[PDB]
Design an enzyme around this catalytic site. Structure first.
Site, short mmCIF file in Angstrom:
data_model
loop_
_atom_site.label_atom_id
_atom_site.label_comp_id
_atom_site.label_asym_id
_atom_site.label_seq_id
_atom_site.Cartn_x
_atom_site.Cartn_y
_atom_site.Cartn_z
N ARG A 70 21.99 -16.27 1.59
CA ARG A 70 22.32 -15.24 2.96
C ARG A 70 24.19 -15.54 2.93
O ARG A 70 24.71 -15.32 3.02
CB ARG A 70 21.89 -13.93 3.04
CG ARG A 70 20.78 -13.44 2.61
CD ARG A 70 21.27 -13.13 1.44
NE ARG A 70 20.40 -12.29 0.63
CZ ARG A 70 20.63 -11.48 -0.75
NH1 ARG A 70 20.90 -11.90 -1.82
NH2 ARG A 70 18.93 -10.66 -1.24
N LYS A 160 6.64 -15.76 -3.68
CA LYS A 160 6.79 -15.23 -4.32
C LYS A 160 7.05 -15.46 -5.73
O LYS A 160 7.70 -16.89 -5.74
CB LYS A 160 8.44 -13.71 -3.62
CG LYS A 160 9.51 -15.04 -3.87
CD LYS A 160 10.33 -14.32 -2.69
CE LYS A 160 11.66 -15.15 -3.24
NZ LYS A 160 13.03 -14.51 -1.92
N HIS A 161 7.08 -14.47 -6.91
CA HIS A 161 7.12 -13.45 -6.98
C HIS A 161 5.74 -13.05 -8.08
O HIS A 161 5.17 -12.99 -8.27
CB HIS A 161 8.21 -12.45 -7.23
CG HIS A 161 9.48 -12.80 -7.01
ND1 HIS A 161 10.49 -13.85 -7.40
CD2 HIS A 161 10.08 -12.19 -6.13
CE1 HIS A 161 11.22 -13.36 -7.03
NE2 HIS A 161 11.03 -12.68 -6.09
N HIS A 172 15.24 -1.77 -21.79
CA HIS A 172 15.56 -0.50 -21.53
C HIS A 172 14.76 0.29 -21.17
O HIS A 172 15.00 1.45 -21.32
CB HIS A 172 16.06 -0.36 -23.01
CG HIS A 172 16.20 -1.33 -23.76
ND1 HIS A 172 15.99 -1.20 -25.07
CD2 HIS A 172 17.49 -1.87 -24.14
CE1 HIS A 172 16.31 -2.52 -25.95
NE2 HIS A 172 18.22 -2.80 -25.05
N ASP A 241 7.14 -5.18 -2.16
CA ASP A 241 9.13 -5.09 -3.33
C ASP A 241 10.00 -4.37 -2.43
O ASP A 241 9.27 -3.12 -1.51
CB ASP A 241 8.70 -4.75 -4.73
CG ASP A 241 9.31 -3.31 -4.77
OD1 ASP A 241 7.83 -2.72 -4.88
OD2 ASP A 241 9.62 -2.94 -5.71
#
EC number: 3.2.1.52
Length: 324
Positions: A70, A160-161, A172, A241
Site C-alpha cells: 500500500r 493468511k489465507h 462463475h 475476511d
C-alpha cells in the site's frame, strides 16, 4: 479493543471518522493506498487515529511486498514474496525483507502488516507471486524467515489465507471454490507454523472446500473451530475476511463471523454497513487483541542508522531488479 476493523476515506480524519473511532466496538483501523499521500502525512493520520480513540487501538495494513504494498513512495520497495526463494540467498533475504517491511511500518506508527501469505503455488491468479513457493518446504523455509524478521522488530504476525488459497484455480459463482478431495499439503503449512508458535493471528480464505464443509472457510464453524482451534490448537487471534464481499445484513453477517469463531471482523469499503454494526451490535471486548500491538517504537531517522536497514533496503532493491 472491540472486534471491528474498519477503514476511512483518505489522508485525514473527518468529523465522522473521529466520532466512530471513539466507539468501543472498533478494535482497529485498516489502511489502504488511498490513505497514504506521504511519510509525514501518514504519521500525522496514525497519530490522529490513536488520539480520537483515546485508548489502545490497532493500525493494520496489507504490506506484503510486490503486488501488495500500500505504501510505496517514501518507503523501501519490498519484492514479491516469491523472489526470495529464487535467489541462492533466499532464507537470508526473506528475513531481511520481513524485517525491513515491518521496521518501516513501525517507524510510521503502524502496528502490523497482514502477512505472511502461507498459500502454496502460483496458479491462483489472485495469489500468484504473493506466495513464497510451490511446495511445502520452499514455503515453510522462506516464510519462517520473513516471520522471524517481523518478530525481530516487535511486529505481530498474521498467516493468511487459512487453510490455503494457493490452488483456487477455478472461477462463475459469487464464492470461489476449491474442490480437491484433500488439501493436506496446503494445510500442513499452516499446521507447522502454528505448532512452531510463530503466528499471532490468522486470516481465513473466503473459499469453499466442498469436500469438507459447505461454508467459505472465513465463515465456517468447522474450519475456524473444529480445525483451527480444536485440531490444530491455534491460540491466537482469528480475523474474518472483509465482510462486504445468504447470511443476512451487516449485523447478521458479523454475528455469524463471530459465532463461526472469529475474534475480530473486518468491514471495508462500506462505511454505512460498519456504522450499522456500531449502532446495533452489543459491545464485546477482545482483550487478547492487545497482543497484536506493536512492541517496539522508533522513528525513521533512528532506523536508517542501523547498518541493517542500509543493507536490507539495498538488498531488496537489487533483488527486485534481479528478477524483472
Amino acid at each position: 479493543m472491540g472486534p471491528l476493523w474498519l477503514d476511512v476515506a483518505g489522508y485525514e480524519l473527518s468529523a465522522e471518522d473521529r466520532a466512530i473511532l471513539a466507539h468501543p466496538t472498533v478494535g482497529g483501523v485498516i489502511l489502504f493506498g488511498r490513505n497514504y499521500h506521504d511519510n509525514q502525512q501518514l504519521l500525522a493520520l496514525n497519530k490522529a487515529i490513536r488520539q480520537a480513540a483515546a485508548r489502545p487501538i490497532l493500525i493494520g495494513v496489507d504490506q506484503e511486498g510486490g503486488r501488495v504494498q500500500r505504501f510505496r513512495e517514501g518507503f523501501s520497495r519490498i519484492p514479491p514474496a516469491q523472489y526470495y526463494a529464487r535467489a541462492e540467498n533466499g532464507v537470508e533475504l526473506a528475513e531481511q525483507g520481513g524485517w525491513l517491511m515491518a521496521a518501516e511500518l513501525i517507524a510510521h506508527d503502524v502496528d502490523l502488516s497482514f502477512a505472511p501469505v502461507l498459500d502454496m503455488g502460483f496458479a491462483c491468479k489472485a495469489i500468484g507471486n504473493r506466495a513464497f513457493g510451490e511446495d511445502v518446504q520452499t514455503v515453510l523455509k522462506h516464510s519462517s524467515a520473513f516471520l522471524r524478521g517481523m518478530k525481530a522488530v516487535g511486529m505481530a504476525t498474521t498467516g493468511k489465507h487459512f487453510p490455503g488459497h494457493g490452488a483456487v484455480i477455478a472461477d462463475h459463482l459469487e464464492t470461489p471454490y476449491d474442490e480437491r478431495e484433500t488439501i493436506a499439503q496446503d494445510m500442513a503449512i499452516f499446521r507447522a507454523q502454528i505448532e512452531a508458535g510463530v503466528l499471532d493471528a490468522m486470516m481465513p480464505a473466503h473459499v469453499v472446500y466442498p469436500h469438507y464443509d459447505a461454508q467459505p472457510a472465513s465463515g465456517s464453524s468447522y474450519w475456524l473451530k473444529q480445525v483451527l482451534r480444536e485440531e490444530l490448537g491455534f491460540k491466537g487471534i482469528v480475523f474474518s475476511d472483509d465482510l462486504s464481499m445468504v447470511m443476512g445484513g451487516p449485523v447478521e453477517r458479523s454475528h455469524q463471523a463471530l459465532v463461526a469463531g472469529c475474534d475480530m471482523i473486518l468491514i471495508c469499503n462500506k462505511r454505512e454497513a460498519a456504522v450499522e454494526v456500531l449502532d446495533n451490535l452489543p459491545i464485546m471486548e477482545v482483550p487478547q487483541a492487545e497482543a497484536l500491538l506493536k512492541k517496539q517504537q522508533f522513528s525513521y531517522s533512528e532506523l536508517k542508522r542501523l547498518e541493517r536497514w542500509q543493507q536490507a533496503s539495498a538488498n531488496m532493491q537489487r533483488l527486485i531488479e534481479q528478477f524483472s
